[PDB]
Amino acid sequence: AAKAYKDYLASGGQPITNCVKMLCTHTGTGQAITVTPEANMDQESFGGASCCLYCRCHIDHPNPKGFCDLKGKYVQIPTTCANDPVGFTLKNTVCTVCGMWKGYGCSCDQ
Amino acid sequence: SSQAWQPGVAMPNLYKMQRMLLEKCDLQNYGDSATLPKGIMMNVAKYTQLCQYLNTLTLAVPYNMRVIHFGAGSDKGVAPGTAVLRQWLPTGTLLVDSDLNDFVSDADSTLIGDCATVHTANKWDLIISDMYDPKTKNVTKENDSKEGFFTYICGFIQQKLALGGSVAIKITEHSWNADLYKLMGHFAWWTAFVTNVNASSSEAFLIGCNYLGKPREQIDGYVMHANYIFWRNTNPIQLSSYSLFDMSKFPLKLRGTAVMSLKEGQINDMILSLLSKGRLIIRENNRVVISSDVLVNN
Ligand SMILES: *C(Cc1cc(C(F)(F)F)nc(O)n1)c1ccc(Cl)cc1Cl
Ligand SMILES: *[C@@H](Cc1cc(C(F)(F)F)nc(O)n1)c1ccc(Cl)cc1Cl
Ligand SMILES: Oc1nc(/C=C/c2ccc(Cl)cc2Cl)cc(C(F)(F)F)n1
Ligand code: NA
Ligand code: NA
Ligand SMILES: [Zn+2]
Ligand SMILES: [Zn+2]
């Protein structure tokens, strides 16, 4: 999980690369995980499976059913954090209300 | 130079009509590289331009469309091409990918291994292939028709492609097959398409649009590959990534193309007419099952 990856980055490890960045209009809704790229002007969209630590490492997913919420979808990452999509997805959590990243789009606390 | 704003260039009809002898491919722009948008890889750019081109053809697009993608694994263990296909294709489209080695994919299902180890009785609406073996290129020997995965591609088309279906198969100067070109004559229309981002390469996608299941025209594959090289050798294509910056019309339009199971004796001239316009798919619509063989030994 993040546990080891965060420590890997903390020590000074290389962030997982080769995440598949997609071409898009950058005029999307800006939601975190979508069926198609929805990056806004401040985001990049990546193929979901390539940004999933579990898929990439070929290890089981943390879910009784073993469901992946990234595989087959697109994940929007702030352009400022696009250099490490796997890390960003681990560290952050999606808002169950508006489907936006907490502190990166979600404004349900206003 | 209006071609630079196109996603790529299709082989002009008059080149298809020649009777050239095969020559070495010597591209004027061989060595140049297009300027890709920041952080975009070639495999994503290339597939984006292929899909932008496929958008201009009469592809059949039925509900629960079935797409299969061969040679989808990259060196880094991911599937960029598959990611572009899933972006392009209508949501809910069944997408299966495949390659010889393991990789992580966004496809609904991923098959690892060669043809002899995978099987399906189900028919498909679109076949995309990026299968290529770099060791096929040998400039010290004669450039003959390649008979490896290409024979399996031809078999798959003739047995598992739905009438009205389409294909886009990657070829190069050295990676080609005479029977595949011949089979292009079994479609309502065909071409060899070169992406603008990879125009410095002999690579092209052989595109067969709307499968008729029978030869509409007789094509000699040896001659047609020679014709392809003649075109490439005499027509420098300017490297361009221009089309990549406008993705507003990218998604394949849902057409809700009719699917039906017709007996071979029911496929008349008016059915052929529908197939040829991308208005009909002929295949059954049973649950899609893919089998994977395992050699067992102690
Ligand atoms: C994931 C690296 C990795 C591997 C393992 C395992 F070996 F124990 F399964 N566990 C963790 O936590 N992480 C990885 C990332 C990127 C690539 Cl290209 C390959 C791998 Cl294996
Ligand atoms: C992105 C964190 C981040 C970085 C910057 C920077 F551009 F100044 F470096 N600015 C903002 O606002 N935010 C991030 C988050 C989490 C992980 Cl694991 C990795 C990254 Cl790159
Ligand atoms: O019957 C059958 N064949 C295949 C794949 C053939 C093939 C052809 C060309 C290349 Cl380059 C690679 C392959 Cl694997 C696949 C399936 C199934 F996947 F649908 F089950 N079922
Ligand atoms: Na997370
Ligand atoms: Na899509
Ligand atoms: Zn996953
Ligand atoms: Zn919210």
JSON list of N, CA and C and ligand atoms in Angstrom, two decimals, chain A residues 1 4-5 16-18 53 56-59, chain B residues 76-77, ligand 1:
[
{"chain": "A", "resi": 1, "resn": "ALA", "atom": "N", "xyz": [0.86, -1.21, 0.00]},
{"chain": "A", "resi": 1, "resn": "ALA", "atom": "CA", "xyz": [0.00, 0.00, 0.00]},
{"chain": "A", "resi": 1, "resn": "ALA", "atom": "C", "xyz": [0.88, 1.25, 0.00]},
{"chain": "A", "resi": 4, "resn": "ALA", "atom": "N", "xyz": [4.55, 1.62, 2.13]},
{"chain": "A", "resi": 4, "resn": "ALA", "atom": "CA", "xyz": [5.89, 1.40, 1.63]},
{"chain": "A", "resi": 4, "resn": "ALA", "atom": "C", "xyz": [6.27, 2.41, 0.55]},
{"chain": "A", "resi": 5, "resn": "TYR", "atom": "N", "xyz": [5.31, 2.80, -0.29]},
{"chain": "A", "resi": 5, "resn": "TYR", "atom": "CA", "xyz": [5.60, 3.71, -1.39]},
{"chain": "A", "resi": 5, "resn": "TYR", "atom": "C", "xyz": [5.96, 5.10, -0.84]},
{"chain": "A", "resi": 16, "resn": "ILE", "atom": "N", "xyz": [7.15, 5.98, -9.69]},
{"chain": "A", "resi": 16, "resn": "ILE", "atom": "CA", "xyz": [6.80, 5.08, -10.78]},
{"chain": "A", "resi": 16, "resn": "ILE", "atom": "C", "xyz": [6.53, 5.91, -12.04]},
{"chain": "A", "resi": 17, "resn": "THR", "atom": "N", "xyz": [7.17, 5.50, -13.14]},
{"chain": "A", "resi": 17, "resn": "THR", "atom": "CA", "xyz": [7.04, 6.20, -14.41]},
{"chain": "A", "resi": 17, "resn": "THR", "atom": "C", "xyz": [6.27, 5.34, -15.41]},
{"chain": "A", "resi": 18, "resn": "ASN", "atom": "N", "xyz": [6.14, 5.88, -16.63]},
{"chain": "A", "resi": 18, "resn": "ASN", "atom": "CA", "xyz": [5.48, 5.17, -17.72]},
{"chain": "A", "resi": 18, "resn": "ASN", "atom": "C", "xyz": [3.98, 5.11, -17.48]},
{"chain": "A", "resi": 53, "resn": "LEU", "atom": "N", "xyz": [-1.00, 1.12, -8.27]},
{"chain": "A", "resi": 53, "resn": "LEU", "atom": "CA", "xyz": [0.11, 0.41, -7.66]},
{"chain": "A", "resi": 53, "resn": "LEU", "atom": "C", "xyz": [-0.13, -1.10, -7.67]},
{"chain": "A", "resi": 56, "resn": "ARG", "atom": "N", "xyz": [0.14, -2.43, -11.33]},
{"chain": "A", "resi": 56, "resn": "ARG", "atom": "CA", "xyz": [1.53, -2.31, -11.75]},
{"chain": "A", "resi": 56, "resn": "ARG", "atom": "C", "xyz": [2.41, -3.36, -11.08]},
{"chain": "A", "resi": 57, "resn": "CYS", "atom": "N", "xyz": [2.22, -3.58, -9.77]},
{"chain": "A", "resi": 57, "resn": "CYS", "atom": "CA", "xyz": [3.04, -4.53, -9.02]},
{"chain": "A", "resi": 57, "resn": "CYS", "atom": "C", "xyz": [2.51, -5.96, -9.11]},
{"chain": "A", "resi": 58, "resn": "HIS", "atom": "N", "xyz": [1.36, -6.14, -9.79]},
{"chain": "A", "resi": 58, "resn": "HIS", "atom": "CA", "xyz": [0.77, -7.46, -9.98]},
{"chain": "A", "resi": 58, "resn": "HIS", "atom": "C", "xyz": [0.40, -8.10, -8.65]},
{"chain": "A", "resi": 59, "resn": "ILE", "atom": "N", "xyz": [-0.03, -7.27, -7.68]},
{"chain": "A", "resi": 59, "resn": "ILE", "atom": "CA", "xyz": [-0.44, -7.76, -6.37]},
{"chain": "A", "resi": 59, "resn": "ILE", "atom": "C", "xyz": [-1.94, -7.54, -6.23]},
{"chain": "B", "resi": 76, "resn": "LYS", "atom": "N", "xyz": [7.60, -1.32, -21.40]},
{"chain": "B", "resi": 76, "resn": "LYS", "atom": "CA", "xyz": [7.52, -0.96, -20.00]},
{"chain": "B", "resi": 76, "resn": "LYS", "atom": "C", "xyz": [6.40, -1.70, -19.27]},
{"chain": "B", "resi": 77, "resn": "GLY", "atom": "N", "xyz": [5.68, -2.58, -19.97]},
{"chain": "B", "resi": 77, "resn": "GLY", "atom": "CA", "xyz": [4.66, -3.40, -19.31]},
{"chain": "B", "resi": 77, "resn": "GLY", "atom": "C", "xyz": [3.29, -2.74, -19.18]},
{"chain": "C", "resi": 1, "resn": "LIG", "atom": "C1", "xyz": [5.73, -2.36, -8.12]},
{"chain": "C", "resi": 1, "resn": "LIG", "atom": "C2", "xyz": [6.94, -2.56, -7.21]},
{"chain": "C", "resi": 1, "resn": "LIG", "atom": "C3", "xyz": [6.45, -3.40, -6.05]},
{"chain": "C", "resi": 1, "resn": "LIG", "atom": "C4", "xyz": [6.59, -4.79, -6.08]},
{"chain": "C", "resi": 1, "resn": "LIG", "atom": "C5", "xyz": [6.12, -5.53, -5.00]},
{"chain": "C", "resi": 1, "resn": "LIG", "atom": "C6", "xyz": [6.25, -7.02, -4.98]},
{"chain": "C", "resi": 1, "resn": "LIG", "atom": "F1", "xyz": [7.32, -7.39, -5.65]},
{"chain": "C", "resi": 1, "resn": "LIG", "atom": "F2", "xyz": [6.35, -7.44, -3.73]},
{"chain": "C", "resi": 1, "resn": "LIG", "atom": "F3", "xyz": [5.18, -7.56, -5.53]},
{"chain": "C", "resi": 1, "resn": "LIG", "atom": "N1", "xyz": [5.52, -4.89, -3.96]},
{"chain": "C", "resi": 1, "resn": "LIG", "atom": "C7", "xyz": [5.39, -3.54, -3.96]},
{"chain": "C", "resi": 1, "resn": "LIG", "atom": "O1", "xyz": [4.79, -2.92, -2.91]},
{"chain": "C", "resi": 1, "resn": "LIG", "atom": "N2", "xyz": [5.85, -2.81, -5.00]},
{"chain": "C", "resi": 1, "resn": "LIG", "atom": "C8", "xyz": [6.16, -2.05, -9.54]},
{"chain": "C", "resi": 1, "resn": "LIG", "atom": "C9", "xyz": [6.06, -0.74, -10.03]},
{"chain": "C", "resi": 1, "resn": "LIG", "atom": "C10", "xyz": [6.44, -0.43, -11.33]},
{"chain": "C", "resi": 1, "resn": "LIG", "atom": "C11", "xyz": [6.93, -1.44, -12.16]},
{"chain": "C", "resi": 1, "resn": "LIG", "atom": "CL1", "xyz": [7.43, -1.09, -13.84]},
{"chain": "C", "resi": 1, "resn": "LIG", "atom": "C12", "xyz": [7.02, -2.75, -11.68]},
{"chain": "C", "resi": 1, "resn": "LIG", "atom": "C13", "xyz": [6.64, -3.05, -10.38]},
{"chain": "C", "resi": 1, "resn": "LIG", "atom": "CL2", "xyz": [6.78, -4.75, -9.82]}
]
